[PDB]
Structures are given as structure tokens and as C-alpha cells.
Amino acid sequence: ETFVMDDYGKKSTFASFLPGIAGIRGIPIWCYYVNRGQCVVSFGVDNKDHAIMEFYPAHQAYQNVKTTGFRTFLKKNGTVFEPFSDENITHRMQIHMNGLAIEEQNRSSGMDTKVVYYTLPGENVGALVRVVSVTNQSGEPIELELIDGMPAVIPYGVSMDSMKNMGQTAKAWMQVEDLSEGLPYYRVRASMDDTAAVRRIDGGNFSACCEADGRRLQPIVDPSLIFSYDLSLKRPVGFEERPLKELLLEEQMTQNLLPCSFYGITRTLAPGGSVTLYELIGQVENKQLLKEYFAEKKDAAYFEAKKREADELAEALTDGIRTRTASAAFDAYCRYTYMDNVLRGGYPMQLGNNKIFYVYSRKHGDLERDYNYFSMLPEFYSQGNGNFRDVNQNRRCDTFFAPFVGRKNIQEFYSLIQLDGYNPLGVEKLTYRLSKERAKKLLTDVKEEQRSALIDFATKPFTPGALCRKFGEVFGDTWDETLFIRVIDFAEEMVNGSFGEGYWSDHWTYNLDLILDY
Amino acid sequence: ETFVMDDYGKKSTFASFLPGIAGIRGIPIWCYYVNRGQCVVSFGVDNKDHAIMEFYPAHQAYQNVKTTGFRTFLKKNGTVFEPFSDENITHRMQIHMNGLAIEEQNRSSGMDTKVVYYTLPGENVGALVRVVSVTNQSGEPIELELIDGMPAVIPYGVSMDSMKNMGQTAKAWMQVEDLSEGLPYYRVRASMDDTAAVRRIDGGNFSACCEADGRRLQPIVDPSLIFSYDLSLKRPVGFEERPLKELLLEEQMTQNLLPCSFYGITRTLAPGGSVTLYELIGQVENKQLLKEYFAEKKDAAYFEAKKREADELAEALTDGIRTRTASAAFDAYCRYTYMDNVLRGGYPMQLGNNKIFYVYSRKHGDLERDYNYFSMLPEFYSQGNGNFRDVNQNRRCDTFFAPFVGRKNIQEFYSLIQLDGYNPLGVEKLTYRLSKERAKKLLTDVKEEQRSALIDFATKPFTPGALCRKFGEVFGDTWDETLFIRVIDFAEEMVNGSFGEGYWSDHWTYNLDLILDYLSVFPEQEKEMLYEEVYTTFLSRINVNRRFRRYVETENGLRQYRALNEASRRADLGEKLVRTEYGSGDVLTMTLMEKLILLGAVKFATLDAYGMGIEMEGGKPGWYDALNGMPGLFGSSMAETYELARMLSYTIEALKQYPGEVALIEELGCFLDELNLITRLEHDNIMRDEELLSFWNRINDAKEIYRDKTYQGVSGKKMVYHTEQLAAILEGFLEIVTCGIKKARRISGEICPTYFTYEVPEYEKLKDGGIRPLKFVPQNMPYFLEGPVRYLKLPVEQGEKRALYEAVKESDLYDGELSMYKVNASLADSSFELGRARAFTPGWLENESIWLHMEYKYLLELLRSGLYEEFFADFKKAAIPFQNPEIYGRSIYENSSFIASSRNPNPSCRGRGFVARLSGSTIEFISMWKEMMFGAHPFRTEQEELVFSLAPAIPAYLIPEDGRLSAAFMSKTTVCYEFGGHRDYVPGTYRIRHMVFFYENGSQATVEGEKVSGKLAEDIRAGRVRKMEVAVDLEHHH
């Protein structure tokens, strides 16, 4: 069920990604990785323009993962080591359906390192979770100083082309705030457009690190403290010459720079001892949501429960094609294939009482498909839009695995055939609308100051995630499920379809397969 | 003349570039470098889309120079060393005007490294030359294996965005060929444009390396051999395990990869021995040209001769401003400043017999100005593009340094002014065209198979470099020069200009400086200049919306967002000149006086509601373009008002000086009559009121009617006016402007204001969808330095100027610690809708920083106003060549756009210069140097006779010990002063005894006194005087 690659640093290069599923009630993110360094190159929330770590094609990813990716520095008795930087030291890599874990065993220094990754499931904030642990495998106590983080965080509000074309000028807008509270906030203060209209920016990125007790640590957002004059980000010149305690008392610049995020601790480890850090990097729309999310302390139990939930999500998703044969590779390949088909096509679920909905769909751009502009809705009941051919092919066997679908696919895909035999290219994501009379009748039992907003929102096309967000905004953290179910049930489906590019001569040949399968 | 920086690896970072000039008969390239690694980050041929080494912004350059730049690996007895990789080993850096050299001295391994760079001059191929030498400084013989080159060469035909966005899929088109011959050729298999008409690329990049004997070496194009599995290009894993001889016998991949170029040798070095390599990287048009170029061997003598030629090229280019003073830094700074001004503005030259051409020009687009898209033609007589303001300012003093230019600049920059007072943004390359009749007449004595091609080429627009390339292609390696000269001579000049982005409100204010500078050399040509009818008019692409349709509503109030009328947008590439008969006749022509009247009439009708400033209704701010949101807040500027007052005064004086008849167009005549009727009315109202809403409405209605009339076409008929009526109308306009200036000064305070912002609380919605403002509420703005700079040009009393100087020096515009003048005061309390100036950290870019251009403008105005002591005191502290190189963190010979002030929160940035050279302060320093060395008006006309006299103003700290100061007059004549004693020589405090003239033929002449009139002035202006001796208070004494 798990694939293990030994000494992946010296092997041939390949690219992959996390599935990026956070559940029905969660915010998904996109993350890509390669088999070099610490195996994370870029991740964001919505698309390339909302990235937290800069997006690179496969060539630049391979070239820059060892410098612009996650970093870790260990100081043992005055000597600085960097795990996952020399390929001659034995390392390891484990790949799960919805996770990734790496580890290094340094027999010279006598310290072992382990890092795991997974997307945070079932929350109102989309973020990436990273856990770092160091174990003392020597025979004598050692004095340890640890530094971990990423050296380049893109502030919210900076587009990809502005970063890759005028990144020198764009540093004038970058800034970071709220260092004292332990929750740094990365954003620009205003629009970067060279027009007569100036707007206000409210969203931002954040980071938070803590030990098992749950108390947040003091961040470091000035890269010049660690690397000093070395702008190549190869040697930690500043960290070698000074203790971490002195660095934490240094004054940090929070403007005119590309900010980083490093956290540090000091500890003396007995033989066989260990220390662990928990990190959270994500993106939010306003500070109020971040404060509401962090209103309660997070500790080790929370993160381990989240990891278990993340594994169980994929397990339950792929439970539908379980099989047992004479080879385990075939059995694992079946589940992986089903998961990939679900990712590119969507998972049919029964929403309400008379609606059929598809979740987890998206545009499938990645590192090697660098010509695509992928997108993914950052909300509950996440979905996306795709091409005619791909969605038509991927939904061929939906009736067998879910009999409640019925003839919905046939009706949907035979209604896009024009009178001249051709069809539009794109299929839009499902959206719903509610009539005036039904909105008036349903919202009688709610306060007027909320009723007006609810009816105004509901009398326009919307998606289930937008409706959930509006309900959370209006009624607060707790709201009636029956009202949401009734609103979804009494709504009306909007017609989808976009022309886009042109007319191909083979799209009509995949429709008979739906009939034959039904 | 040479700047040396020791241990540049640990110092603060800075960016620079090679000038890139390759001579008249050469192919230029652009190259940038930083003070990290081996100090080259990117170079190409034409623009960012034809780079050989990938172009990066400064932040990415500082990070990727050590990995994607030039690399060198040395294996000594089995151990691999990489020079310029560790900052703890002593290294050095030398910077020349047209070169660069670095070296490292590793005392542990006992080997020294040295590499120099320069651009190949005077050849048919543009390339970068790199010479690497390694010396054995140990006491025992060693066995050396050397590998040198670059790890990533972009094949020709791959655009910048293709590499930035889809660099993985783009590798399918890449290939490298001709490895056996030793001349690799990098190009794509086919055009990456799916919709193209070629599907085949002839051009490509190349590389060639050889030792002193000249035999080319076998290249390595597969990066997987050197680095093996390490794709980070950090460890030469493959080279550490195998000998170079084994690597050279390996099989290399030439497809589906990003190729490199490495060359290697094996040698044993005796104690004190050394080995050298020569490399060439560049671009060629086709393989035939490359074979022709490499038909003859290239050895060390060829490269050293090319280096000498490259140095002499820059030396001769900058020889025109040579001077000697008490400090050598001043002279070096003068030469570097002149070179930078030439680079950004172009170098005038005499082409053929009746053509004036500008070469070496380009657009300032260096690593720190990453938003500019520069261009540079890779051909003979190379030239480039630029913006209106920058090129207009950089060509202010061309007439003084080159009298043969004449009135070309005035005609060129007054023909880009449209009928509505605005102008396009970009200026394009000059091009020529030839008629079929002249082409047939000239090409009678050539073969038909060549004649047809020649006439077909010449009947279309072309540049001289394209013509040279065509002649080389047709007639072969050698062709007649006289035919080329005749073809250039009989050709016709084509117009140029591109709209680009939009309309600013200050581009018209720099035209009067050209006239003022021209009249300082030919004072007797004023009447001929005024009534010369050669000037044309550019054809506008977009029109500005009427005021009622220019306003939109928002939750914050009323705004001004829809400045341009997008519905009436003409298509580009169409006719570029205004023609008579509503666009169907011949080209319309005007005199300079008509242009001045048009500028005076239109700008007067753009006053704000209070009649103080000039509204920026074009959608863009003035000179200070960081306030991009100001036009949305009904902004207006007083600098435009001051410039309008100065222009009106000059026009009135010119009209009164030469009485006669003036012909004006019908629409302009009607508009001027309406404006006169409006201004003679309400005269008692504007002198006795605060708000002038009715006057604003009247003038705006008249201006809108004129715009709507003239945008769609003009008949072409002319009205006749006498000078007295125009003089009276302009006098009325000037009186109104003066009253407005007085009101603004009363409202603002002790320092003259610069900007105003208006609030409109109540308005009216019209039936057509427009919005009619009903009242305006003015709002004050923070202090700006541009205000006093523009104000000091107006004619006012000396005491008022001194009081203004005293008020400014003790205000918030003066930085006490740095003893410099900031560009503006604090913007903290102002609205956030002004623009990106509010989002900038204080002390960075255009926010409370020491912007060098405005400071130099202020110093020049102080010098021109007659405040000599203050000018000397402030120039001693503010000038670049008098700074501390350690604090400045750069060569003191190079200018900077701005210097971070004391308000910057970073203590390590206060006093550093940024955004490299190629600033607008070069022309200001040139003007200051000229006025200090020769005076305001070297030539005057008295009793209808030319008169020449000198009046220098030199401070004490510039006179040498022996008291002999020399400078170049008009770049051809040397003037040698000799001062009696060491003191400040201010006009009126000294008298010139006599002058001695040395002619070019050996004759001499002596004139008593400081005044020369008659034929001698004509001779000295014509360049027939080789040297001058000037004595002030007799011989020097100690």
C-alpha cells in the first residue's frame, strides 16, 4: 500500500503531487513535489496567481528545489549540519495516497531527521501541515540548536508574471506584520496596478509553529539574519557565527524584502531523546477568520487526529474498488487508478434529496503540463470545470459504481449537441438559483436583517460552497442543517456550457459508450 | 580612470552593465553584471527575447549568478577547486569604461585565476569575448585539468516568456549541431509559433574556444557529463570521478535538452607557468557568414588588437568633454557622465551629405529597471527606441557639442505635438525610403539580376544597417561606397512615433529648453527659426472624453476614471501625419510660431475650478509619476502653471521683437477668438472671487468644441493675424495666470505649492448619463521640491529668491545628516488613493529619498539665479564625485537614480545609491559644467555683429596648484585659463587681461580685453581655432 524509494537523490527525476482533497467540509490546496531535496517545490490555494511558494516548471523545479524549498539547519556542539543536502548519506522516501514522508539517517553526526506532509482536512482554512523531528542516536548528550522553515514566502496579492518579470520592483509593496502575536501576516497593502484606481487588500498568508505543549514560537522573517551576505541561500553564514538566542534578540526588517519564515528552539538531548515541531502554512481571506481559527490552542493530539482523518478520507474514497489477488501491486494500482479517475472526473455524491453533485473535480495542470492554467475552488463542496472529451470519457462507468446516478450523464452530454452536430468545448461547474416566491416562503422564520441578505444572495446563481460560506457569515459558527437542505432542495439547476475555442471532429463519438454502459 | 574594489563578494550588492557599443561598422550586444560570482548574469543581441544567457531581474540575478553564470573548474592532482566560489579567499575587481576584469589569489592551492570581458568591436558578428588565465604560483610542478564555459545556453528562437512559463515543454524544439567542426550551432528545429510563414530558422548562437595557436577545441554540450545526477549545477560529480580525456570520448546528447558549452585542456605547469584560453559567444545570421568569419585563424594578437580597439572606441567617444581640474575624480566623472548621456540619448553623426543620424541610443532597461522593454538593432549604424521625456531631455546640449546638428531637434520634437496639445509616448528608429524614379535613375550601371533586388529593397522603408546588409548580400564582401552614399543622399526621411500607453501632463514643458539652448549658439537665427514652415503634426490615436462623461460614482464619493474615449480609438500602423482636405490632401505644415500659439491657447483652457493649477485630465500625473491615483482625485499641478507663464512671456517677447504677419488655422483662430472674448469678460470677477465655476465651464466648453472639431479632420485653410492682436491676447492670458499664481501663493504658505486636490460634495446627474459638478473644495498637499525648482525660473527679485532658499533649507525638504535635499515631505497623513507613493517605505524610490535628478535641477537653478556662494557650498556636499565610496557602496564615477535618505528604516541603506546609472541627472550635470566653465551666453549679437566673450564661475577647490585649468570648448577647441590666485572667481569680481588664439594652420592672434567681435568670432565658432590662452589677473603667484 506504500511505495518506498531508497536514495531517491541519485535516482532519475520524476514529478508528482498530493491529491489535494480536504473532504466535503474543507478547503483544498494544490501542492507539487519532486524527488530532490526535501521534496516540495510549490503550493498555493486557488491557482498560480495565489501561490505561497513560487510555481516553477519541471526543469526549474529540479534546479531550484534544493535552494528555494524547505530548509533545515542543525547545530551540534558548534558545527552546523544540513539534512537532505548530501546524497552520499542514506535517505528514504515513502509515498501514500494522501501523504508524503522522508527521513535521513546520518551515521557520522549521529542524528536522524524525519519530515511528513499532508493537507489539513475538515477545516475552514486551507493549509499545509509539516512535522519535523530530530532524534539523538549517539551515546552522549548533545546541545542542539534547530532552525527550520522556508526562505521565500510570496505575499498575498502578487501575481506570477509580476514575480517572474519585475520581481525587483515588486519588493517595494511587500511587508509582514503581527510578529509579536506569533502569527505573521504576509500581504501587500494596496493594488500594484498602474492605473488611476487604487484598491485595498485584505487577504494574506500566515505561518505558525509550536511544540507539543501548543505554545506558538517566535518567528524570523528577515533572511539576512541567517545567510548574512550570501544571497545564493547556500550557506547559513549568520547562524554559524552567532547563537540562536542572540539572533532572536536582533532587530528585523519587515519591509522592502522577500520575507521568509524560520522558527528555532534550543535543547539538550539525552541519548535516545528527540524533539518535534509542528508547522502550518496557509492562506486566509481576512484576519477575523484566522483569529477565529486560532482562538483555541493546537497541540500534538490535534495534528495526529488530523493525519488519521486525512488517511481515512482517501481510504474511504477508494474503498469502492477493493480487490484481492495474487499480486499486491495490482491491488494497489487499482485503488490509485480509481483515485486518479476521481480526481480528473469528480466523485458522484447524493446532495439533498433530488440533486446529483460531483466533487473534487478540477483542471489538471501540473509541473510537466506547464501550458495549462489550472483552477480549483477554495470552498466547501469543491468542484471545477473541464474539457468535453475528458469529462465525457471519465464518467463512463459512473452508473456501475453508483446506481443512483441514473440517466443523468446521458441527458447532460446529449444536450450539448447543437443542431449542426458540433458541440462547445467546456463544461461549466454546477450552479443553482432560487425563485422569488420560494425564497419568500422559506425564509419566513428568520430575522429580517438576515432575511433580506439571505434572499438577496439566494435570488442569484450560486454554488453550494458559496451558500455554506454565506450561512456561516450570517448565522455564525452554528446554523441549521435543515434550512440548508431545504434551500438546496427547492433550488433550480442552471444550464451550463461554454463555446471557448472551436469545433473538433471526434467529440460526438464518445456518447454511445454512456448508453451502452447504462 | 579605473575603479578597484577589493573582496567584492562580501560587500553590498550593486548592478551595472557594459556600454555595448561596437563602433559604426559592428554588431552591438547588451550585457549586464553584478558583484557576485564571476560577474556576468545575462547577455543577448536584440532584446530580452533573444538572450544567450537568460535575463533575470536584480533579485533573481543576485541569487542565480553563482549557478547559471560562467563556471570554471580546476583539478590539481585529483582534487577539484572552483575559483570565485568562496568569499574567504582574496579576490579583486577592476572596472573600465568599456571592460571588466576580475582575479582571485588562492594561497592554499597556490593557483591564481584571472578573467577579462569585452565586446567584440568592428566585425560582422556580435559576440562577447572572455579570456581566462590560470597561473601556477607554487614551487613544484603540477598536473592541471581545466574546464571552462557556461552551463545553460538558450537556443536561438526561444522567447523569454516561453522559458519563464513553459520551459519544460519548450525543450522539444531545442537542438545543437556541428559538433565535429568545433563550431556548435544552437537553434530550434522549427519556429515555435504555430501560425508562422517560415517554419525554418537561419540564425543561431555559437561558441568557439582556442589557445594561443588558434586551433579550436572540442566542445562539450551535454551538461549530464559534468554534473551527472546533480541537477542543481552545484557539484561537478562527473568531473570529480573521471579524467577529462575519458569525458571527451563519451557520447553526447544533442536533442531534447537545454545545452551548455564547456571546453577543456590538459597540461602540466612548471613553477611560474601559466595557460590561457580565448572564448567567443554570440549570434550569427546564417552559417555562411560564420564560415566566412572563421575562414582565417584567430590567435592572441587578434584578440589583443580587438581589446585595444575596444578601449580606443570609448576613449574617442568621450574625448569631447576632456577637462583638467584639481581633482581627477571630477574629470573621470565628467567622462563617464558624458558616456552615459550618449548611451541614453544617442550620438549625433553626419551621414552622407545632408542627413543627421543618431547612433548607440537605446532604452534604459537594466536589471533594476525591469519594467522597461529595451531594444537595440544588431546591425551597422545601430540605433534604438526610447520615451519622449527622456530622449527630449537628453538632447538638450547637442548643438553646443555638434554645431552641424542645427535645428533638427526642435523640428523633430515640435512635430510630435498633436492638435490637442498631447503627444505619443515612444519615439522609434529613423527609416528612409526611395521613390521608383530615383531608384531607376541611380541603378542603371548594375546588372539586372542585382538591379531588380536592389530596387525592390529600396522602394520600401529601411534603415542604413539593413541597406549595408543588403549590399553585402548582393555585391559580396566588397561593394562600392559611392553607391551607398548616393542611395542614402537621395532617400527621403520617414516619420516615427508610437502612442504606447497614454497621455501625461508635463511632456510639453521640455521643448522650450531646446530653443533656449539653440539660441545660445546662433543668436542671429531667431527670426529665421520662428517663421520656418517645415513643422508637421502627428495624428492622434485616442481622444479624451468630455468632462461630463469623465466622472463616475463610488462609495467614497465622486471620482474621475474614464479619462480616454475608447470608442473613438484609431487603429495603429495607419497614416501618421495630419493631411489637408479632411485627410485626403497633402501634408499640413506649420511655422514654429503657430506651434507656440497652439500650445499657449490649449494649455490656458485647462485651468482648474479655482484657476490656480492645470488639471491632469489625461489620466496620468506629471513629472512625479508615482502619484498615479492623483488624477482620480481631480488633481492639478502648479509646475505646469509656472511653465505656461514662462512660455507665454517668451512668446510675447518674440512677437513684440519681430513685427509681421502670422498665418493660423481656422479652428485655432476661432478658438483663440472665443478665448479672448471669454477672458475679456469676467475680468473683474476672477480678480475678486475664490471659485470660478462659470469661467471653468466656458473655457472647457470651448476646448471641447475645438477638440471635437480637430480630431476628425481639418480643412486646411489659413487665417491671417497681425502680431499686435496675438500679443494683446497673450498678455491677457499671462495676467490671468499671474493672478492665479498670486492666489495660490497666498493660499499655500511660505513655500510655493506643487499640487492641489479637490473634493466635490454635491453634483447633478444628467439625462445623458453624465455628471455635472456643482462645487469644488480645494485640499492642501505636502511639500515637493519641484515647486521651487519651477518657480525659480520665473523673473522675480533677488531678495525673494534668497528668502525662498532660506525657507527651503530649514524646511522638511532638507536632510540634515546627509546635507542633501529630499524629493518630498512626509506623506503619512495623506490619503492612500494618491498611488503607489503611499505604499512605499519612507526613504525608498520616490518617497522622501534623495532623488538625484531633482537635486541637480535645484542646484542648476541656484547657479543660474546668481546665488554663487550657496551653490558652491551645496555642490561641494551633494555632488557624486565628492562622496565617500565606502558609504556610497559603488564607483564614484557612476550616477544613481536616488540615494536612500535618513528616513529609511534600514540603517545599512542610508547613503547608498540604487537603480544604477543612465539617470536623467547626466544632462543636468553637463549643463552645470558648461555654465561653470564658459558662462551663460558665450555668443551675443551687438550692432548686427557677432560678439564672443567668456565669463567663467569656478570655485576655489577646483583650481590646480599651478593655477592652470583647461576644458574643451565645442569639443574641438581647448581653452586654458590661468588664474592669479587661489580664490572663488565669481563674475564681476575679476577681469580678463588678454586672449591668444592658435589657428590650425600655425598662425596666431592676440586680442586685448575680454571681448572679441568680427571675423574672429566666426572663425572660433566654425572650428578654425585650435587652442586658446586666457589670462586672468596676469600670471599665477604663490
Ligand SMILES: OC[C@H]1O[C@@H](O[C@@H]2[C@@H](O)[C@H](O)O[C@H](CO)[C@H]2O)[C@H](O)[C@@H](O)[C@@H]1O
Ligand atoms: O515608481 C517606480 C517606477 O514605476 C514605473 O511604472 C511602472 C510601470 O511601468 C509598470 O507597468 O507597472 C509598475 C507597477 O505598477 C510601475 O511601477 C515608472 O515608469 C517609473 O518612472 C518609476 O520609477
Ligand SMILES: OC[C@H]1O[C@@H](O[C@@H]2[C@@H](O)[C@H](O)O[C@H](CO)[C@H]2O)[C@H](O)[C@@H](O)[C@@H]1O
Ligand atoms: O504537444 C505538446 C502539448 O502541446 C499543447 O499545446 C501547447 C499550447 O498550449 C501552447 O500554447 O503552445 C505550445 C507550443 O506551440 C503547444 O505545444 C497541447 O495542448 C497538448 O495536448 C500537447 O501534449
